[PDB]
């Protein structure tokens, strides 16, 4: 028993081959079986022929008799077909409205999540269909993770280097930090976890969360978890007020916090607020600023990853009372300076998949660009708050979509919050960028920020760009441009002060080669978000859509605080780059 996903009509008929088993009203279920390949009908019992040794599972061939369901070959004389008169017999048959068009639901429930069109339908459909699309996309990702083979430690060549034998007949997952494995210790009759691990080409260089002395026998698989049903929408209904509702602003605020006071009042004027924060603008400065601005308000800080919420705790520890703050951790080393698992504390810090069921005066979403409609819906089902604050940036990276192969996911399709602010504009905006010099700011303001991003620093004259195709080589799951690295090596010899820089690239293999050749610390652009360095060296290494991602490139070259060197393969972004150009040595 449930509610029809297209009608909200009470129903018990679930599409049997449809992975999330959604409740479909008799008319809706009839259309879903007659217009797709879904032929299994699940009700309280299945509408499967209960005759011995029968495989008939299509409802349009089934007849109800006596007290059961039979195929035409096995049916008794007296019956009426389960599929007749434009509806399927079942619970709540009379109370049924139906839908004029079933195309969107069919497209979402039949898609393999490999096309950008699937995501555009998922993020542009109705709220209930949005929820179903989120459920089926996460379930499809979870099952696809199981499609990868088992990697077992055959030989431990040294520390930080292993030798892995892979399962036959199954694909090997790409070796990058986006694929987090888990070890398993061989026992008498079962297996036990030995931690979470990441892998990279060497042999294979492994980086586990907890150091161990693993030997021959340990194996790694990508951990999967049960996909929970959704009930709450991705966004609560918008409400606009004439006064600040449920909050009391402080009468004494510091000049560190005065710039956002007007934005702190707008947070009180609406049910939910969308906030865009450029690199180095003080997104943590703002969100923790709402805490002191409303001292009596109970605020829950939530984020998708452990890293961001800990960074919020780090900035909270700098400005907020340690006794009133709490860090919720499920039963990964994270923030451990607040009291652990204290739901009823005034200031609660936790991630999406571990938030408890509670209420608060304000709930703070950080890093909303990596958030999906699933994470949006889950927390709203967990937290009921008077005010809702979404902080993130469309011009920054999204959560990776492994199944996506065709097309590029525009920011206005990452999630519901990203869709509004990319269309109706952000509710507030901080126009001051404090980290990068003006030249990076002016380049990234025109590219993605509508020229709305202002710089706080002046021009640094250490932002340097070079156009160099080089030679691109490909390994199993990444790309390498050794001549691009060689140019950087020649640059370092003539500019020894640039050896304090951090090497960044959109490919892990490029970082692996550059680390041994240059010796600089290496970071992928996806992992570099939320960090900062004085100098960085960026190599595009390709001209692919992965490297030319205007959200990624915004993230890539903006991790430098003083100076930057960009070896570019794409002419379009090179021309957009307002840096001082060089000639190839």
């Amino acid at each position: 028993v449930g509610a029809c996903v297209l009608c909200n009509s009470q129903t018990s008929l679930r599409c049997g081959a449809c992975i999330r088993r959604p409740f479909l009203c008799c008319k809706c279920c009839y259309d879903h079986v007659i217009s797709t390949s879904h032929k299994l009908v699940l009700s309280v019992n299945p509408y499967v022929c209960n005759a011995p040794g029968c495989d008939v599972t299509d409802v349009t061939q089934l007849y109800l008799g006596g007290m059961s369901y039979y195929c035409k070959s096995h049916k008794p004389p007296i019956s009426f077909p389960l599929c007749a008169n434009g509806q399927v017999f079942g619970l709540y048959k009379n109370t049924c409205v139906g839908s004029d068009n079933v195309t969107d639901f069919n497209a979402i429930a039949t898609c393999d999540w490999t096309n950008a069109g699937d995501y555009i339908l998922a993020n542009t459909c109705t709220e209930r269909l949005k929820l179903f699309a989120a459920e089926t996309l996460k379930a499809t990702e979870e099952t696809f993770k199981l499609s990868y083979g088992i990697a077992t430690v055959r030989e431990v060549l040294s520390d930080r280097e292993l030798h892995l034998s892979w399962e036959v007949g199954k694909p090997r997952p790409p070796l990058n930090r986006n694929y987090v494995f888990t070890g398993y210790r061989v026992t008498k009759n079962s297996k036990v976890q030995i931690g979470e691990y990441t892998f990279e080409k060497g042999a294979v260089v492994y980086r586990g969360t907890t150091t161990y002395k693993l030997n021959v026998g340990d194996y790694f698989v990508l951990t999967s978890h049960t996909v929970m049903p959704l009930s709450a929408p991705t966004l609560v209904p918008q409400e606009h007020y004439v006064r600040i509702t449920g909050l009391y602003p402080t009468l004494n605020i510091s000049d560190e916090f005065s710039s956002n006071v007007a934005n702190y009042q707008k947070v009180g004027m609406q049910k939910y607020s969308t906030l865009q924060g450029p690199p180095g603008t003080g997104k943590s400065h703002f969100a923790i600023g709402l805490a002191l601005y409303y001292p009596s308000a109970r605020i829950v800080y939530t984020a998708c990853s452990h890293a961001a919420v800990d960074a919020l705790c780090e900035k909270a520890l700098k400005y907020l009372p340690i006794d009133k703050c709490s860090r919720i951790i499920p039963a990964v080393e994270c923030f451990d300076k607040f009291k652990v698992n204290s739901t009823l504390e005034q200031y609660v810090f936790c991630t999406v998949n571990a938030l408890p069921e509670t209420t608060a005066d304000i709930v703070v979403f950080d890093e909303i660009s990596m958030a999906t409609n699933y994470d949006l819906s889950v927390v709203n089902a967990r937290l009921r708050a008077k005010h809702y604050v979404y902080i993130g940036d469309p011009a920054q990276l999204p959560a990776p979509r492994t199944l996506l192969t065709k097309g590029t996911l525009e920011p206005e399709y990452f999630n519901s919050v990203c869709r509004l602010m990319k269309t109706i504009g952000p509710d507030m905006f901080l126009g001051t960028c404090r980290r990068c010099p003006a030249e990076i700011v002016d380049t990234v303001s025109a590219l993605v920020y509508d020229n709305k991003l202002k710089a706080h620093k002046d021009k640094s004259a250490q932002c340097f760009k070079m156009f160099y195709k080089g030679v691109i080589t490909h390994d199993v799951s990444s790309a390498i441009n050794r001549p691009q690295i060689g140019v950087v090596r020649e640059f370092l010899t003539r500019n020894p002060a640039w050896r304090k820089a951090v090497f960044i690239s959109p490919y892990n293999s490029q970082n692996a080669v550059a680390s041994k050749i240059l010796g600089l610390p290496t970071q992928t652009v996806d992992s570099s978000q939320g960090s900062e360095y004085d100098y960085v060296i960026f190599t595009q290494t390709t001209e692919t859509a992965h490297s030319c991602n205007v959200n990624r490139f915004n993230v890539a070259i903006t991790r430098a605080k003083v100076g930057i060197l960009c070896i570019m393969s794409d002419r379009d972004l090179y021309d957009k780059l307002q840096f001082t150009s060089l000639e190839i040595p």
Binding site: L91, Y92, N94
Partner: protein, 396 residues
Amino acid sequence: NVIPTITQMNLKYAISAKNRARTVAGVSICSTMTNRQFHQKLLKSIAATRGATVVIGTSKFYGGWHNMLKTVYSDVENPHLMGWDYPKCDRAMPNMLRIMASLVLARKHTTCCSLSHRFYRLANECAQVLSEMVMCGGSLYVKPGGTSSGDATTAYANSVFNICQAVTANVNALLSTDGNKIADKYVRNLQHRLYECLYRNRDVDTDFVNEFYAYLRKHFSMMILSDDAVVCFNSTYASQGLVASIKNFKSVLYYQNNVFMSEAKCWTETDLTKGPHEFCSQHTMLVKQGDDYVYLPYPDPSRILGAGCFVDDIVKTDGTLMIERFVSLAIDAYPLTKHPNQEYADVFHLYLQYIRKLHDELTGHMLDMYSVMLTNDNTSRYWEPEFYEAMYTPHT
């Protein structure tokens, strides 16, 4: 051959009036098969006979209770009613009497089995239902004796043991009487020949066995069901010490059962227009129906109300899913309408009204929500007294 087996010790979960954790015996399958291939045919005849002393298999509906009570009143001179119950029948019964019951049950194989076959069947029975090895909570223990409730022939063996105890009580009552004071020549000669046949003869005398059986049937009429018994006896002979009284039962139990019985288990009735005080936990009341006075059994109303209020599974807590549960209870509680006490009839009337309310509630969840009507007309008789009155009328 001999096949020792293991019988598991399960723990029951049911409604009761005293806090004892009653347990039952999960006997194995081989013993079940081999004991069936004997006592299926032995006992299906017992369960299908009407008018005998053992009333196993006789229903109380459609006038069965009246027929049984009138049969047990079969021509007694100065009738009184008496009843008793053994304190611990299963856990204190000696092995000798169980062996005796098994032997009298196997007496029916005079043709199909030779002596060796009978002995080995008896050995198998003694090995797996008398002194078997019981598994109580994951450990094996040796059973001292008694009887295992959960085998094929528990009730019939209990009936045999009950009849044996009654006959022993009668014999002890007759042989212990003075004898010089007995004023009836026939009874004095009966006593003399009873002593001769007990302690002066090594072989069975069928003539005196028939004579004494006729005497017992004439003056001491029994009705036996497992360990329950109701007896109609000549009061004058019992007062004179010529048939077994209740103290004769107590002495026999004391010296042949290692058990002392008290008045909490036994009762007497001097007016037989009221029926037995208790038999199978049913009270008997003489009512009038259709120009005839009949006997109807009614239960303790507390039992019916407790069965209504407390349930085994949580699904039974919702009335609409289990309505036949209340129909059966109303069938069992109908005879309370005739009781002089008003609350007893109020129980049955309350049950009928609750059944009506349950039917209306079931109809409402349907019509309102998923628009369908299933009231029918065969349901309307479930809250009328005719359907239940027909259960106690002798026409089937």
